[PDB]
Coordinates of C-alpha atoms in Angstrom, one line a residue:
Chain A
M1 CA -0.9 34.5 74.2
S2 CA -3.8 36.1 72.3
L3 CA -5.3 36.2 69.2
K4 CA -8.0 39.1 70.2
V5 CA -8.7 42.6 67.8
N6 CA -9.7 45.3 69.5
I7 CA -11.6 47.6 66.4
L8 CA -14.1 50.0 65.5
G9 CA -15.8 49.6 68.6
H10 CA -16.0 45.6 69.2
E11 CA -13.9 42.7 70.8
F12 CA -12.7 40.1 68.2
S13 CA -11.6 36.7 69.8
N14 CA -9.4 36.6 66.1
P15 CA -8.8 38.2 63.1
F16 CA -10.3 35.8 60.9
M17 CA -13.8 36.2 59.2
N18 CA -14.9 35.0 55.4
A19 CA -14.2 37.4 52.8
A20 CA -17.7 38.1 51.1
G21 CA -18.3 36.0 48.8
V22 CA -18.3 33.5 50.6
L23 CA -20.4 31.1 53.1
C24 CA -22.1 34.0 54.1
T25 CA -25.6 33.9 50.4
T26 CA -28.1 32.2 53.1
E27 CA -28.7 31.6 57.0
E28 CA -28.4 28.4 56.6
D29 CA -24.9 30.1 55.6
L30 CA -24.9 32.3 58.0
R31 CA -25.5 29.9 61.0
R32 CA -22.5 27.8 59.9
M33 CA -20.2 31.1 60.2
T34 CA -21.6 32.4 63.0
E35 CA -21.2 28.6 65.1
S36 CA -17.6 28.8 63.3
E37 CA -13.9 29.6 64.4
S38 CA -14.0 32.7 63.4
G39 CA -13.4 35.8 64.9
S40 CA -16.2 37.2 62.8
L41 CA -18.5 36.7 59.7
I42 CA -19.3 39.6 57.4
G43 CA -22.7 38.6 55.1
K44 CA -22.4 38.5 50.9
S45 CA -22.5 41.2 48.6
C46 CA -26.2 42.2 48.1
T47 CA -28.4 45.3 46.1
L48 CA -31.1 46.5 46.7
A49 CA -33.3 43.7 45.1
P50 CA -32.7 39.9 44.9
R51 CA -30.5 38.7 42.3
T52 CA -29.7 35.1 41.1
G53 CA -26.3 35.6 39.4
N54 CA -24.7 34.9 36.6
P55 CA -25.1 32.3 34.0
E56 CA -23.6 28.5 34.6
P57 CA -21.2 27.3 34.7
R58 CA -20.3 29.7 36.4
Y59 CA -17.5 28.6 39.7
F60 CA -14.4 26.8 38.7
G61 CA -11.9 25.3 41.5
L62 CA -7.8 25.3 40.1
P63 CA -5.0 23.9 42.0
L64 CA -3.6 27.6 42.4
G65 CA -7.1 28.7 43.8
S66 CA -10.8 30.1 41.7
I67 CA -11.9 31.7 38.9
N68 CA -15.8 33.0 38.9
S69 CA -18.2 35.0 37.6
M70 CA -20.5 34.7 40.3
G71 CA -22.4 37.8 39.5
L72 CA -23.4 38.7 43.0
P73 CA -26.0 36.5 43.7
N74 CA -27.7 37.1 47.0
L75 CA -30.5 37.4 48.9
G76 CA -31.7 41.7 48.8
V77 CA -31.0 43.9 51.5
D78 CA -34.6 43.3 53.1
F79 CA -32.8 39.9 53.6
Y80 CA -29.2 40.1 55.0
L81 CA -31.4 43.5 57.1
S82 CA -33.4 41.4 58.7
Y83 CA -30.3 38.8 59.2
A84 CA -28.7 41.9 61.6
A85 CA -31.7 42.8 63.0
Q86 CA -33.4 39.5 64.2
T87 CA -31.5 36.9 63.4
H88 CA -27.5 36.8 64.2
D89 CA -26.5 36.3 67.5
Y90 CA -23.8 38.8 68.8
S91 CA -23.0 37.2 72.0
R92 CA -21.2 35.0 69.8
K93 CA -18.6 37.5 67.2
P94 CA -20.4 40.9 65.4
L95 CA -21.5 41.3 62.0
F96 CA -20.1 42.7 59.4
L97 CA -22.2 43.3 55.8
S98 CA -21.7 43.7 52.0
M99 CA -23.3 45.8 50.4
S100 CA -22.6 46.2 46.7
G101 CA -25.0 48.1 44.9
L102 CA -24.9 49.0 41.5
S103 CA -25.6 52.6 41.2
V104 CA -24.3 55.2 43.7
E105 CA -28.4 56.1 44.0
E106 CA -28.9 52.0 44.7
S107 CA -26.3 52.1 47.3
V108 CA -27.7 55.4 49.2
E109 CA -31.1 53.9 49.5
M110 CA -29.3 50.4 50.7
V111 CA -26.8 51.9 53.8
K112 CA -30.6 54.1 54.5
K113 CA -31.2 51.5 55.7
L114 CA -28.9 50.4 57.5
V115 CA -28.4 53.2 59.8
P116 CA -31.3 51.9 62.4
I117 CA -29.9 48.4 62.5
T118 CA -26.2 50.3 62.9
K119 CA -27.9 52.0 65.9
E120 CA -29.1 49.5 68.0
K121 CA -26.9 45.8 67.6
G122 CA -23.6 47.3 65.5
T123 CA -23.7 45.8 62.5
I124 CA -21.0 46.9 60.5
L125 CA -21.1 48.6 56.9
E126 CA -18.4 47.4 54.2
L127 CA -18.5 49.3 50.9
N128 CA -18.5 47.1 48.0
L129 CA -15.7 49.2 45.5
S130 CA -14.8 45.9 44.0
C131 CA -17.2 43.2 42.7
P132 CA -15.1 42.4 39.0
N133 CA -18.1 39.8 37.6
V134 CA -21.2 42.0 36.8
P135 CA -21.7 42.7 32.7
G136 CA -21.4 46.2 31.9
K137 CA -20.7 48.3 35.7
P138 CA -17.1 47.9 36.1
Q139 CA -15.0 48.4 39.2
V140 CA -16.0 51.5 41.0
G141 CA -12.6 51.5 42.3
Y142 CA -10.9 52.1 39.5
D143 CA -12.4 55.3 38.3
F144 CA -10.9 57.6 41.5
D145 CA -13.8 60.0 40.5
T146 CA -16.3 58.0 40.8
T147 CA -14.7 56.2 44.2
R148 CA -15.1 60.0 45.8
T149 CA -18.5 60.1 44.8
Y150 CA -19.9 57.0 45.7
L151 CA -17.8 57.7 49.3
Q152 CA -19.1 61.3 49.3
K153 CA -23.2 60.3 48.8
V154 CA -22.2 56.8 51.2
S155 CA -20.7 59.2 53.9
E156 CA -23.9 61.9 54.3
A157 CA -26.4 59.1 54.0
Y158 CA -25.0 56.5 56.4
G159 CA -23.5 58.6 58.1
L160 CA -21.6 56.2 61.0
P161 CA -18.0 54.6 60.9
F162 CA -17.8 52.0 57.7
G163 CA -15.5 50.5 55.6
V164 CA -14.8 50.0 52.2
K165 CA -14.1 46.7 49.9
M166 CA -11.1 48.1 47.5
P167 CA -10.3 45.9 44.0
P168 CA -5.9 45.9 43.8
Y169 CA -4.2 48.4 42.7
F170 CA -0.8 46.9 40.4
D171 CA 1.1 50.9 40.1
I172 CA 2.2 53.2 43.1
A173 CA 0.6 56.4 41.6
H174 CA -2.3 54.1 41.9
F175 CA -1.5 53.4 45.6
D176 CA -1.5 57.7 46.1
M177 CA -4.6 57.9 44.0
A178 CA -6.3 55.8 45.9
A179 CA -5.6 57.3 48.9
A180 CA -6.1 60.4 48.6
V181 CA -9.8 60.2 47.6
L182 CA -9.9 57.8 50.5
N183 CA -8.0 60.3 53.6
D184 CA -11.0 62.9 52.5
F185 CA -13.3 60.8 53.6
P186 CA -12.9 60.6 57.7
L187 CA -15.9 58.5 58.3
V188 CA -14.1 55.3 55.8
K189 CA -12.2 53.8 58.9
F190 CA -10.8 50.5 57.2
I191 CA -9.8 49.0 53.8
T192 CA -10.3 45.1 52.9
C193 CA -7.3 44.5 50.2
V194 CA -8.3 42.9 47.7
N195 CA -11.0 42.1 46.3
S196 CA -10.1 39.1 43.9
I197 CA -7.8 39.7 41.1
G198 CA -10.3 40.8 38.1
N199 CA -10.9 39.7 34.5
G200 CA -8.5 36.4 33.9
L201 CA -8.9 33.3 31.8
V202 CA -9.0 29.9 32.3
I203 CA -8.7 27.9 29.7
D204 CA -9.0 23.2 29.5
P205 CA -6.2 22.1 26.9
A206 CA -8.3 19.7 26.6
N207 CA -11.7 20.2 24.6
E208 CA -9.9 23.7 23.9
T209 CA -13.2 25.3 26.1
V210 CA -13.0 28.5 28.3
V211 CA -14.2 26.7 32.1
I212 CA -17.5 29.5 32.9
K213 CA -19.6 30.9 30.4
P214 CA -20.2 34.6 32.0
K215 CA -18.8 37.1 29.8
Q216 CA -16.7 34.6 27.7
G217 CA -14.5 32.4 30.1
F218 CA -13.3 36.1 32.0
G219 CA -14.1 36.0 36.0
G220 CA -11.9 36.8 39.1
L221 CA -8.9 34.8 40.8
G222 CA -8.6 33.7 44.4
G223 CA -6.4 32.0 46.4
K224 CA -2.3 31.3 45.9
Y225 CA -2.5 33.9 42.9
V226 CA -3.4 36.5 44.8
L227 CA -1.4 36.6 47.8
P228 CA 1.8 39.1 46.9
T229 CA -0.7 41.5 45.2
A230 CA -2.7 41.7 48.2
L231 CA 0.1 41.9 50.6
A232 CA 1.0 44.5 48.3
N233 CA -2.1 46.3 48.7
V234 CA -2.4 45.9 52.7
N235 CA 0.6 47.5 53.9
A236 CA 0.3 50.0 50.3
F237 CA -2.7 51.2 52.6
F238 CA -1.2 50.9 55.8
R239 CA 1.4 53.4 55.4
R240 CA -0.5 55.9 53.5
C241 CA -3.4 55.9 55.4
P242 CA -2.6 56.4 59.4
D243 CA -6.0 57.8 59.8
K244 CA -7.8 53.8 59.3
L245 CA -7.7 50.2 59.6
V246 CA -7.0 48.0 56.8
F247 CA -8.0 44.1 56.0
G248 CA -6.5 41.7 54.2
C249 CA -8.0 40.3 51.7
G250 CA -6.8 36.8 49.5
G251 CA -4.3 34.0 49.4
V252 CA -4.7 32.8 53.0
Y253 CA -4.1 29.3 53.9
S254 CA -2.7 28.8 56.5
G255 CA -1.7 30.7 60.3
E256 CA 2.0 31.7 57.9
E257 CA -0.3 33.4 54.7
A258 CA -2.1 35.2 57.9
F259 CA 0.8 36.3 59.9
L260 CA 2.2 37.7 56.6
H261 CA -1.3 39.5 55.9
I262 CA -0.8 40.6 60.0
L263 CA 3.0 41.8 59.2
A264 CA 1.8 43.9 56.3
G265 CA -0.8 45.7 59.0
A266 CA -4.2 43.5 58.2
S267 CA -6.3 44.0 61.6
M268 CA -8.5 40.9 60.1
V269 CA -7.9 38.4 58.0
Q270 CA -10.8 37.4 54.8
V271 CA -10.8 33.7 54.0
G272 CA -12.3 33.0 50.1
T273 CA -10.9 30.5 48.4
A274 CA -9.4 28.2 51.4
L275 CA -12.7 28.3 52.8
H276 CA -14.9 26.9 50.1
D277 CA -12.2 24.4 50.0
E278 CA -12.2 23.0 53.2
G279 CA -15.4 24.7 55.2
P280 CA -15.7 26.2 58.1
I281 CA -13.5 23.2 59.8
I282 CA -10.3 25.9 58.3
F283 CA -10.7 29.6 61.3
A284 CA -10.3 26.3 64.1
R285 CA -7.3 25.5 61.5
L286 CA -5.7 28.6 61.2
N287 CA -6.6 30.2 65.3
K288 CA -3.6 26.8 66.0
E289 CA -1.1 28.0 63.2
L290 CA -1.3 31.7 64.2
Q291 CA -0.9 30.7 67.6
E292 CA 1.6 28.9 66.7
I293 CA 3.7 31.1 64.9
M294 CA 3.6 33.8 67.4
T295 CA 4.6 31.4 70.1
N296 CA 7.8 30.1 67.9
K297 CA 8.6 34.1 67.6
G298 CA 7.2 35.0 71.4
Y299 CA 5.1 37.7 70.3
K300 CA 2.2 37.9 72.9
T301 CA -0.6 39.7 71.2
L302 CA -0.6 40.5 67.2
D303 CA -0.1 44.7 68.3
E304 CA 2.9 43.1 68.7
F305 CA 4.0 42.9 64.8
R306 CA 1.2 44.1 63.3
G307 CA 2.3 46.7 60.5
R308 CA 6.3 45.6 61.4
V309 CA 7.4 44.2 57.9
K310 CA 11.1 44.5 57.7
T311 CA 12.8 46.0 54.9
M312 CA 15.8 46.7 53.1
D313 CA 15.9 49.7 51.9
Chain B
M1 CA 3.7 18.8 11.1
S2 CA 5.0 22.7 10.8
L3 CA 5.8 25.1 13.6
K4 CA 5.9 28.2 11.7
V5 CA 4.3 31.4 12.0
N6 CA 4.1 34.2 8.9
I7 CA 4.4 37.4 10.3
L8 CA 5.5 41.0 9.7
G9 CA 7.1 40.1 6.6
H10 CA 9.4 37.3 8.0
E11 CA 8.9 33.3 8.5
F12 CA 10.0 32.4 12.1
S13 CA 10.6 28.9 12.5
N14 CA 8.5 28.4 15.9
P15 CA 6.6 30.6 17.9
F16 CA 8.6 31.1 20.8
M17 CA 10.9 34.2 21.9
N18 CA 12.4 35.6 25.1
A19 CA 10.7 38.3 27.2
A20 CA 12.5 41.5 27.0
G21 CA 13.4 41.0 30.1
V22 CA 15.5 37.8 30.0
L23 CA 19.0 36.6 28.5
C24 CA 19.3 39.3 26.2
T25 CA 20.8 42.7 28.3
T26 CA 24.3 41.3 27.3
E27 CA 26.3 40.4 23.1
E28 CA 27.2 37.3 25.2
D29 CA 22.9 37.0 26.2
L30 CA 21.6 37.8 22.6
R31 CA 24.2 35.3 21.4
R32 CA 23.1 32.5 23.3
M33 CA 19.4 33.2 22.5
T34 CA 20.3 33.7 18.9
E35 CA 21.8 29.8 19.1
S36 CA 19.1 28.0 20.3
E37 CA 16.5 26.9 18.5
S38 CA 14.2 30.5 18.9
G39 CA 12.1 31.2 16.8
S40 CA 13.2 35.3 17.2
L41 CA 14.5 36.7 20.2
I42 CA 14.6 40.2 21.2
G43 CA 17.1 42.4 23.3
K44 CA 16.2 44.2 26.7
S45 CA 14.2 46.9 26.7
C46 CA 16.3 50.1 26.5
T47 CA 17.4 53.6 27.4
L48 CA 19.0 56.0 25.7
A49 CA 21.8 55.9 28.4
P50 CA 22.8 53.1 29.9
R51 CA 21.8 51.9 33.7
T52 CA 22.8 49.3 35.8
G53 CA 19.7 49.5 37.6
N54 CA 18.3 49.0 41.2
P55 CA 20.2 48.1 44.0
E56 CA 20.9 44.4 45.1
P57 CA 19.4 42.0 46.3
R58 CA 16.5 42.3 43.1
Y59 CA 15.5 39.0 41.7
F60 CA 13.8 36.2 44.0
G61 CA 12.8 33.1 42.5
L62 CA 9.1 32.1 44.3
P63 CA 8.0 28.4 44.1
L64 CA 5.2 29.7 42.0
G65 CA 7.4 31.5 39.7
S66 CA 9.3 35.1 40.6
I67 CA 9.5 38.7 41.9
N68 CA 11.5 41.4 41.0
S69 CA 12.3 45.4 40.6
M70 CA 15.8 44.7 37.7
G71 CA 15.6 48.3 36.5
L72 CA 15.6 48.0 33.7
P73 CA 18.9 47.6 33.1
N74 CA 20.8 48.0 30.3
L75 CA 23.7 49.1 27.9
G76 CA 21.9 51.6 26.1
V77 CA 20.6 52.0 22.5
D78 CA 23.4 52.9 21.5
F79 CA 24.6 49.6 21.7
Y80 CA 21.4 47.4 21.1
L81 CA 21.2 49.6 18.1
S82 CA 24.7 48.5 17.2
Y83 CA 24.2 44.5 18.2
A84 CA 20.3 45.1 15.3
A85 CA 23.3 46.8 12.2
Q86 CA 26.4 44.8 12.6
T87 CA 25.9 41.5 14.9
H88 CA 23.1 40.0 14.8
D89 CA 23.2 37.1 12.3
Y90 CA 19.5 37.4 10.0
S91 CA 19.8 34.1 8.8
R92 CA 19.6 32.7 11.9
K93 CA 16.1 34.2 12.9
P94 CA 14.7 38.0 12.9
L95 CA 15.2 40.0 15.8
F96 CA 13.4 42.4 17.7
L97 CA 14.5 45.3 20.0
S98 CA 12.9 46.4 23.2
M99 CA 12.8 50.6 23.9
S100 CA 11.5 51.9 27.1
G101 CA 12.5 55.3 27.3
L102 CA 11.7 57.1 30.4
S103 CA 9.9 60.5 29.2
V104 CA 8.3 60.7 25.2
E105 CA 11.1 62.8 24.6
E106 CA 13.6 60.6 25.1
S107 CA 11.2 57.4 23.8
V108 CA 11.7 59.5 20.3
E109 CA 15.4 60.3 20.4
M110 CA 15.5 56.5 20.5
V111 CA 13.1 55.0 17.7
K112 CA 14.4 58.1 15.4
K113 CA 18.0 56.5 15.6
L114 CA 16.7 52.9 14.9
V115 CA 14.6 53.8 11.3
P116 CA 17.9 53.5 8.8
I117 CA 18.3 49.6 10.7
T118 CA 15.1 48.6 10.2
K119 CA 14.9 49.3 7.2
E120 CA 18.4 47.8 6.5
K121 CA 18.2 45.1 8.5
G122 CA 14.7 44.6 9.1
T123 CA 14.9 45.2 13.1
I124 CA 11.6 45.2 14.9
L125 CA 10.8 47.5 16.9
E126 CA 8.6 46.5 20.6
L127 CA 8.1 49.7 22.7
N128 CA 7.4 49.5 26.1
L129 CA 5.0 51.1 27.9
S130 CA 5.2 48.6 30.8
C131 CA 7.5 48.6 33.2
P132 CA 6.8 48.8 36.8
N133 CA 10.3 49.0 38.3
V134 CA 11.4 52.3 38.4
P135 CA 11.0 54.5 41.0
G136 CA 9.5 57.2 39.7
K137 CA 7.7 55.8 36.4
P138 CA 4.0 54.8 36.5
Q139 CA 3.3 52.4 34.0
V140 CA 2.6 54.3 30.8
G141 CA -0.4 51.6 29.8
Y142 CA -2.2 52.6 32.5
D143 CA -2.7 56.6 31.5
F144 CA -4.5 56.3 28.8
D145 CA -4.2 60.1 27.7
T146 CA -0.5 59.8 28.2
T147 CA 0.1 56.5 25.5
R148 CA -2.1 58.6 22.7
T149 CA 0.5 60.7 23.3
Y150 CA 3.4 57.9 23.2
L151 CA 1.9 56.5 20.1
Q152 CA 1.0 59.6 18.4
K153 CA 5.0 60.2 18.3
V154 CA 7.0 57.5 18.1
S155 CA 4.0 57.2 14.7
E156 CA 5.4 60.6 13.1
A157 CA 9.3 59.8 14.4
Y158 CA 9.6 55.5 13.3
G159 CA 6.9 56.0 10.5
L160 CA 7.1 52.2 10.3
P161 CA 5.0 49.5 11.8
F162 CA 6.4 48.8 15.3
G163 CA 4.3 47.0 17.9
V164 CA 4.1 47.5 21.8
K165 CA 3.7 45.6 25.3
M166 CA 1.4 46.5 27.5
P167 CA 0.9 46.3 31.8
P168 CA -1.7 43.8 32.3
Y169 CA -5.6 44.9 32.6
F170 CA -7.7 43.5 35.1
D171 CA -11.7 45.2 34.4
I172 CA -13.4 44.8 31.0
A173 CA -13.8 49.1 30.7
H174 CA -9.7 49.0 30.5
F175 CA -9.5 46.4 28.1
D176 CA -12.2 48.7 25.7
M177 CA -10.7 51.7 26.3
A178 CA -7.0 50.6 25.4
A179 CA -7.6 49.2 22.5
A180 CA -9.6 52.1 21.9
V181 CA -6.9 53.9 22.3
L182 CA -4.5 51.4 20.5
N183 CA -6.7 51.3 17.6
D184 CA -6.1 54.7 16.8
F185 CA -2.6 53.9 14.8
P186 CA -2.4 52.0 12.4
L187 CA 1.2 51.4 12.8
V188 CA 0.6 49.3 15.6
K189 CA 0.7 46.1 14.0
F190 CA 1.4 44.3 17.6
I191 CA 0.2 44.1 20.8
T192 CA 2.3 42.3 23.6
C193 CA 0.3 41.1 26.0
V194 CA 1.6 41.2 29.4
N195 CA 4.1 42.8 31.3
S196 CA 4.4 41.5 34.9
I197 CA 1.7 41.6 37.0
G198 CA 3.3 44.9 38.7
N199 CA 3.8 45.5 42.5
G200 CA 3.0 42.7 44.7
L201 CA 4.7 41.8 48.2
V202 CA 6.8 38.9 49.0
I203 CA 8.0 38.3 52.9
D204 CA 9.8 35.6 53.8
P205 CA 8.0 34.8 57.6
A206 CA 11.2 34.0 59.5
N207 CA 13.0 36.8 59.2
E208 CA 9.9 39.1 58.6
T209 CA 11.9 40.8 55.9
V210 CA 10.9 41.3 52.0
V211 CA 12.6 40.1 49.5
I212 CA 14.0 42.4 47.5
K213 CA 15.7 45.5 48.2
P214 CA 14.4 48.5 45.6
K215 CA 10.8 49.8 46.8
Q216 CA 9.5 48.2 49.9
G217 CA 10.8 44.7 48.6
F218 CA 7.6 46.0 46.0
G219 CA 7.8 44.0 42.2
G220 CA 7.2 42.8 40.0
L221 CA 5.2 38.9 39.6
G222 CA 6.3 36.3 36.9
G223 CA 5.9 32.7 36.5
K224 CA 2.9 30.9 36.8
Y225 CA 1.2 33.4 39.2
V226 CA 0.3 35.1 35.4
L227 CA -1.1 33.1 33.4
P228 CA -4.6 33.3 33.6
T229 CA -3.9 37.3 33.5
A230 CA -1.9 36.8 30.2
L231 CA -4.1 34.8 28.0
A232 CA -7.3 36.8 29.4
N233 CA -5.3 40.3 27.9
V234 CA -4.5 38.7 24.9
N235 CA -7.8 37.2 24.3
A236 CA -9.5 40.7 25.4
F237 CA -7.1 42.2 22.7
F238 CA -7.1 40.0 20.0
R239 CA -11.1 40.2 20.1
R240 CA -10.9 44.1 20.0
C241 CA -7.7 44.4 17.8
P242 CA -8.9 42.4 14.5
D243 CA -6.2 44.3 12.3
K244 CA -3.4 44.0 15.0
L245 CA -1.4 40.5 15.8
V246 CA -1.1 40.0 19.6
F247 CA 1.1 38.3 21.2
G248 CA 1.6 36.3 24.5
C249 CA 4.2 36.9 27.5
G250 CA 3.4 35.1 30.9
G251 CA 3.5 31.6 32.7
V252 CA 4.6 29.4 29.8
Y253 CA 6.4 26.5 31.1
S254 CA 5.5 23.7 29.2
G255 CA 3.8 23.1 25.0
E256 CA 0.9 23.1 27.4
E257 CA 0.7 26.7 28.1
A258 CA 2.0 27.8 24.7
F259 CA -0.6 25.9 22.9
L260 CA -3.1 28.2 25.3
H261 CA -2.2 31.5 24.4
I262 CA -2.4 30.4 20.6
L263 CA -5.7 29.5 21.7
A264 CA -6.2 32.6 23.1
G265 CA -5.3 34.6 20.3
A266 CA -1.4 34.2 20.4
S267 CA 0.9 34.3 17.1
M268 CA 4.9 34.6 19.1
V269 CA 5.0 33.7 22.9
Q270 CA 7.1 34.8 24.7
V271 CA 9.4 33.1 27.7
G272 CA 10.7 34.4 31.1
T273 CA 11.4 33.4 34.7
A274 CA 10.7 30.2 32.8
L275 CA 14.1 30.6 30.4
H276 CA 15.4 32.5 33.4
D277 CA 15.0 29.0 35.3
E278 CA 15.9 26.8 32.9
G279 CA 18.1 28.4 30.2
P280 CA 18.3 28.3 26.5
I281 CA 17.5 24.8 26.2
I282 CA 14.0 25.7 27.1
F283 CA 13.8 26.0 23.8
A284 CA 13.9 22.8 22.5
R285 CA 12.2 21.2 24.4
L286 CA 8.7 23.6 24.3
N287 CA 9.2 22.8 20.4
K288 CA 8.9 19.2 21.6
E289 CA 5.9 20.0 23.5
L290 CA 4.4 21.8 21.0
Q291 CA 4.7 19.2 18.4
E292 CA 3.8 16.4 20.7
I293 CA 0.3 18.2 21.2
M294 CA -0.7 18.9 18.2
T295 CA 0.3 15.3 16.8
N296 CA -1.6 14.2 19.9
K297 CA -4.9 15.8 18.3
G298 CA -4.1 15.7 14.6
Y299 CA -3.5 19.5 14.1
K300 CA -0.6 20.1 11.5
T301 CA -0.1 23.8 11.5
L302 CA -0.6 26.7 13.9
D303 CA -3.0 28.5 12.3
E304 CA -5.6 25.2 12.6
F305 CA -6.0 26.2 16.2
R306 CA -4.7 29.8 16.4
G307 CA -6.9 32.0 18.1
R308 CA -9.8 29.6 18.4
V309 CA -10.2 28.7 22.1
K310 CA -14.0 28.0 22.5
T311 CA -16.5 29.8 24.7
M312 CA -19.9 28.6 26.4
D313 CA -21.4 32.0 25.5

């Protein structure tokens, strides 16, 4: 039995990694991810200059997941590049960096700095077009003209294979339109589906008050809320973007949910809220549970069932 | 203590009604709704000609709600108009009809037929711009130019106050853009937030197969999945459209969720998946539970707390 994944010119021990908002902001966070049983890790979605993020409270755990409005708190791109160039142990696992500039110009400046480090160390770029928590900055992935511009300018400036993290879509026409843009950019080799369900609102009935401070309580939803949306987006892009890979993100708490993501088409599987709740020990559990499912079904490798979800029509 | 609501020229006994996909397709359904303790009821989202809808299986109950791709099965506009004109007992409660033509031309023809019945009987129109389950027909509410066209032509053809049912939005710019369109149409007096979270995907891990037949398993999500999204949309339009009412739809299983919808700004509260599960006796329970919460908080009327959700900013 093998959980190995061979993609993007790298060997991965298993398909699991963190989502780019969880356990990846500081050097200590990244050490803990590297020492875990995860197949990879991704650095916090970063900006050209450091950010402290939105005011507190900005995170609230829920029975079915979480709501947050973190606002891209990060140590600045130079920190994550220095980690990638000097600190990370690539003998343990490959490294992704999430770059989330708040304009195309900012994103271009950031990815240019990464070029030499990618060439030397193999660091992989995930361009973030999905953050729903920065006041005054709409999710880029919901504007297909703006998305085209980001992909054009990053393709030009970076010039190497990279991936994109997308917001969730909820209409078939949007899957079609999104795929039409993505398929014009051959350097986009993977698509991460999905970042949180944006701009939900949680109210505490006891005190009649919202649970987070930023944006009048409006924040991104994670956890069990996201699973069917995530599966749909993974499968939609798996079918529409045959020249690319899809990574799953949303609602993974167990090997069973991981299995479903991979069945829908996922090459890698990102863990967010469940990792926040359980800590990096979760990766050992997820490897074991996925192995158990494969053993029961008689699958020897992930390639036997990736993207092989059955339909009735 | 009172659960009464005074809107749209009527006194409603309480704020509860069905959502326009549940217990409202046939004459028997509508009789059961009328005999229930609900404050109102709405006829099935209808089309000019009858539809039998999508192939089976097209509904699947989930631990956290439901997934469906019903495909607007309905008896045709003439049936619901005849119900509104001849059958419905307006002494029990007011009646809404949901009209969901698949083109502007179809919707115009349908609303023209309603005009005399609205004038005679007081039947209220909810124009559906939200159905995520008709193959080849995107959700109108996600195209703001098309939405403008529908609202312009229905305003001209119908000429009396009406409401609209919207798909959920997930980005602040979309709340802004949607509200800007809606605020150009003074005849739009209410906004129902939200219809299902569109185009989710549920897969059974045991047989590796999707759970519904239409659209390769892609279907609208209801129930506990949708509550924070529904609350967010209710409150976003409550604040952005001060000259309009908002109705809440999504995630209501108890008086507590109803209370939250009303706090967020809802005038009426529509019950979907929970009503499908429990049947029309649910309305008696919801009335009791909402009254209990009000008694515990010392509230005498809904107007004491409607739209009074507290923020920290």
